[PDB]
């Protein structure tokens, strides 16, 4: 691995990479951060504590022009795996947590491509606030949300957007939580009806506020009432 | 951000984040303290503790972190990791679980005049003595006592945040309303020491009324 | 023990843990993975989580961490902190609510030939579809999917150490009997 040792030394030592500084030519510019969310599994929804526990893989994508190289000058290397603490990160956190765990669980390596694109897919176990509507329990449906923003950066420094996918050479936004049809195991009590994703911008807040922008991934989940039916309702009603 | 890099290099040359900013001996650092309540998580009567999610709002001046924007490409403000600058050791004194500090240090916003605004998040479990006499048709008076753990009033002076509203801020749209508790009052007060080692406090009070529908239906 | 000190100083003078440990970047790092199941801690049917105690044996050759024992007083093997070297980033893909990767960074046994053996412990909380149809006479089939999170097969290759998991040091369970076990 001579060649990527040369490339890492070229990027970080020769060009003097500074991860404290954002990847921008001027301060007034904003860094575009594209976010997607994959739901590995819905762990639980505790009604008494009103807490949604989820396992999510967060796909971050941005551009760092300082981390560009010509592939044929470096042995046709097209991608690098780097520890996330060498490079600048757009520190996204779960704003609406209810346990103090704002950050991702496992800080995996970033993937850096020769054309300057930084890809990062940290997984996380999140415990979020989900107020519970008990009106139709056990025939109820709940509307939980995972709100993602940056407390270290505002809309003046990073611009949050949704991931973009392609089909028939046509680009579209990914406006939903990604679920693998084969690898996903459904929760034993909750069935996902809707799973949208939205970029919410508050026009009232100033542009230098962390509360201006966020990306929210919603889970509309219907309870499967067979357990409660069989074990409570039929005995109680009879 | 080469200009920002030079500005940070200038600001942090010879800077010691463990040293309180005082241009002269005897100068007091005025720290304005305010609170935003993101969520009243719970009030556990068995443990006698109020669980809340908040954003602190700490404002103070550090003369060492001042610069002329004209000499630095018109940069009027910076966002800096909180561990890099001096912080006042403002903690929740009446925590119940032994956790004094904030949940995430995040970043301070430093203006060119030396003003520093820090808004860390915090998940706090504070002690609250439950008045059990009228439970579940009761109201409780749960306080969050914030103060410097080490510095005395001759070194760090506290004041209630405003700019004058002496209250806990609750954002109307984004507040997670508790299903069992209604916030009646939410003032904030500056408590002076009795009559160094003396220390002021900023106490944020939450007077909260229980909503007893569950106990009416079930008991 | 001065020979070992000199060797350890020599090895990590021009070492990088970011860089993959083979001679050419077009080569693939060959990692042998084995799983030892020490204890089946618990099966949670509600949240569908199997929690187990495991040792995740990982073996691979580091091209740059080689030496001649004759040059170092006959030292043929040493123990090195795992944080100091490149490692494969094995992740439990079907983790339910536990740790995704190894968090207990124990020491690695390094031979003079560059072969590294690293056997960290872990508590795996894995998501297992629980079929309650025949409960309490139910048979379950719970899996542990392991893979390099950020490295694909063209840069890092993982192979099983054995066809079956290592159950030699398995504690008896008061609730379950492992009839069959197999790694693919």
């Amino acid at each position: 691995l001579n060649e990527e040792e040369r490339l890492i030394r070229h990027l970080f030592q020769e060009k003097g990479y500074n991860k404290e500084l954002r990847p921008v030519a001027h301060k007034e510019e904003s860094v575009d951060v594209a976010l997607a969310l994959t739901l590995s599994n819905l762990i639980s929804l505790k009604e008494v504590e009103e807490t949604l526990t989820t396992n999510v893989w967060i796909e971050h994508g941005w551009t760092d022009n300082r981390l560009k190289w010509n592939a044929e000058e470096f042995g046709n290397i097209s991608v690098l795996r780097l520890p996330p603490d060498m490079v600048w990160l757009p520190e996204i956190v779960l704003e609406n947590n209810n346990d103090g765990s704002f950050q991702i669980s496992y800080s995996c390596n970033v993937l850096v491509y020769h054309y300057g694109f930084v890809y990062w897919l940290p997984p996380a176990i999140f415990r979020s606030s989900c107020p519970i509507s008990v009106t139709y329990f056990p025939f109820d449906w709940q509307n939980c949300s995972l709100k993602f923003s940056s407390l270290k950066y505002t809309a003046k420094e990073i611009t949050l957007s949704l991931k973009q996918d392609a089909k028939e050479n046509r680009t579209y936004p990914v406006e939903w939580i990604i679920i693998d049809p084969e690898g996903f195991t459904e929760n034993g009590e909750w069935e996902i009806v809707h799973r949208p994703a939205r970029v919410n911008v508050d026009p009232r807040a100033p542009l230098d506020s962390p509360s201006r922008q966020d990306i929210t991934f919603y889970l509309i989940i219907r309870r499967k009432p067979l357990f409660y039916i069989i074990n409570i309702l039929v005995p109680c009603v009879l | 951000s080469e200009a920002e890099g030079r500005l940070r290099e200038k600001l942090f040359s010879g800077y010691d984040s463990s040293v309180r900013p005082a241009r002269e001996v005897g100068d007091r650092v005025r720290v304005s303290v305010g609170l935003i309540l993101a969520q009243l998580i719970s009030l556990n009567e068995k443990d006698e503790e109020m669980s809340t999610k908040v954003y602190l709002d700490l404002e103070w001046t550090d003369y060492r972190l001042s610069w002329d924007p004209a000499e630095h490409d018109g940069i009027d403000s910076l966002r800096i990791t909180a561990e890099s600058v001096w912080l006042p050791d403002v903690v929740l004194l009446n925590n119940n679980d032994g956790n004094f500090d904030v949940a995430l240090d995040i970043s301070v916003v430093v203006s060119s005049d030396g003003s520093v605004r820090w808004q860390p998040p915090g998940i706090y479990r504070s002690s609250c003595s439950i008045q059990v006499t009228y439970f579940p048709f009761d109201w409780q008076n749960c306080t969050m006592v914030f103060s410097s753990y080490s510095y005395d009033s001759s070194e760090v002076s506290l004041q209630t945040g405003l700019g004058g509203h002496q209250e806990i801020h609750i954002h109307e749209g984004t507040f997670i309303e508790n299903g069992q508790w209604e916030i009646i009052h939410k003032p904030s007060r500056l408590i002076q020491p009795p009559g160094e080692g003396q220390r002021q406090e900023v106490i944020f009070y939450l007077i909260i009324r229980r909503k007893p529908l569950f106990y009416l239906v079930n008991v | 023990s001065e020979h070992e000190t000199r060797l350890v100083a020599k090895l990590f003078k021009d070492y990088s843990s970011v860089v993959r440990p083979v001679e050419d970047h077009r080569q693939v790092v060959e990692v042998t993975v084995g799983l030892q199941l020490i204890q089946l801690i618990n099966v949670d049917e509600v949240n569908q989580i199997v929690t187990t105690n495991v040792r995740l044996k990982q073996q691979w050759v580091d091209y740059n961490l080689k030496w001649n024992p004759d040059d170092y007083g006959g030292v043929k093997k040493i123990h090195i902190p795992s944080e100091k070297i490149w490692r494969p980033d094995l992740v439990l893909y079907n983790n339910a609510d536990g740790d995704f990767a190894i968090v207990k960074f124990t020491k690695v046994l390094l031979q003079y030939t560059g072969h590294i053996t690293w056997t960290p412990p872990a508590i795996f909380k894995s998501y297992c579809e629980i079929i309650v149809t025949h409960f309490p006479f139910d048979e379950q089939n719970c899996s542990m999917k392991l893979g390099t999170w950020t490295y694909d097969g063209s840069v890092v290759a993982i192979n099983p150490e054995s066809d079956q998991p290592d159950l030699s040091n398995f504690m008896e369970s008061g609730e379950w009997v492992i009839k069959e076990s197999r790694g693919w």
Partner: antibody
Amino acid sequence: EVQLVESGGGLVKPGGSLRLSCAASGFTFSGYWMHWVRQAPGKGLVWVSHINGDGSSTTYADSVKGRFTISRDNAKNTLYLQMNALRAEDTAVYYCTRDVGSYGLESRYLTYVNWFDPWGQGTLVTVSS
Amino acid sequence: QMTQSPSTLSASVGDRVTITCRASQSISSWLAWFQQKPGQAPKLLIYKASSLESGVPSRFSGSGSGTEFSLTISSLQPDDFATYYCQQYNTYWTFGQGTKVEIKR
């Protein structure tokens, strides 16, 4: 573009003193070790001295161990070399150069290499009586 | 200590050149190769004994480890006639006595 410009040379009598200066531009001056390297007329390159990024650590050649003093000012982006007890054997073109391999060594992922990549045009010092 | 060879080397355009360097003690890979044309400053060609600089032509190559190292020019060009130096680092920096490449006639 990375640039190093030297100055402060000329004719000095033996036993005197001189101050060589090197102005840097195009990179973070404080983040790199810096070296002074002399080339006598019609001879090869000879390393004079080395200074850390902050300036805590300094190193000198055996022939200039007690007579030279390397220093730096990161605010002005200026490397300096004070020379004392000059002799006729110190007549040379002096070069200031940046050690690229010393950047980011506080991180555990980067180790040092000798990578004197950018060199200034140099400045001539003539020690003669 | 450093020993370069040959002190002088005559060749023409298109010929292969190999300049050898020898250390009295094992310096592992801490070696750089520099080029210096007359009247100019040194230019680093290789660092760590095999790593080409970003802007250097690919004809230049570097090999060697421990004590024996070498610089190879596959095809000489008019701009490659210069004095080639080597430098090592064990605990201080030591340059080796240079070697000059001249046009052969």
